[PDB]
């Protein structure tokens, strides 16, 4: 499923401030990383990242590609490729707790300016 900005804003409203991250910053982050697509798959050399939150099999979920993964979110990675982002959010919260926003942004200055652009203005 490909969400719109305003759709995700409604779904994610309650996570605003979690780990000290503002909603617009998170929406910005998701745009850059998955384009708001629940089915996004990015394959790297030694790991794959899945879904809206681009959750990696290296540490976070169980996949046959990386048998030794710690599987911190205690879930099969296929769960991050469906249309229900509930479990995705559960795992993203763990990521925010442990790694923070730099899991996604890697210490780059992305999503630091004009954050109001990421708000839903339509309703
Ligand atoms: Ca899911």
UniProtKB/Swiss-Prot annotation:
Zn(2+) binds at residues 49, 116. Coiled coil: none annotated. It is found in: Secreted. Ca(2+) 1 binds at residues 38-39, 81, 83. Disulfide bonds join 6-120, 28-111, 61-77, 73-91. Transmembrane segments: none annotated. Its main location: secreted. Regulatory subunit of lactose synthase, changes the substrate specificity of galactosyltransferase in the mammary gland making glucose a good acceptor substrate for this enzyme. This enables LS to synthesize lactose, the major carbohydrate component of milk. In other tissues, galactosyltransferase transfers galactose onto the N-acetylglucosamine of the oligosaccharide chains in glycoproteins. This is Alpha-lactalbumin. It comes from Homo sapiens (Human). The gene is LALBA.
């Amino acid at each position: 499923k490909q969400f719109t900005k305003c759709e995700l804003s409604q779904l994610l409203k309650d996570i605003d401030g979690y780990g000290g991250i503002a909603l617009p910053e998170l929406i910005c982050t998701m745009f850059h990383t998955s384009g708001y697509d629940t089915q996004a798959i990015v394959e790297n050399d030694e790991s794959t990242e899945y879904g809206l939150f681009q959750i990696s099999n290296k540490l976070w979920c169980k996949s046959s590609q990386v048998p030794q993964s710690r599987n911190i979110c205690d879930i099969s990675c296929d769960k991050f490729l469906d249309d229900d982002i509930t479990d995705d959010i559960m795992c993203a919260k763990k990521i925010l707790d442990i790694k923070g926003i730099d899991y996604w942004l890697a210490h780059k200055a992305l999503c630091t300016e004009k954050l109001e652009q990421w708000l839903c203005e339509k309703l």
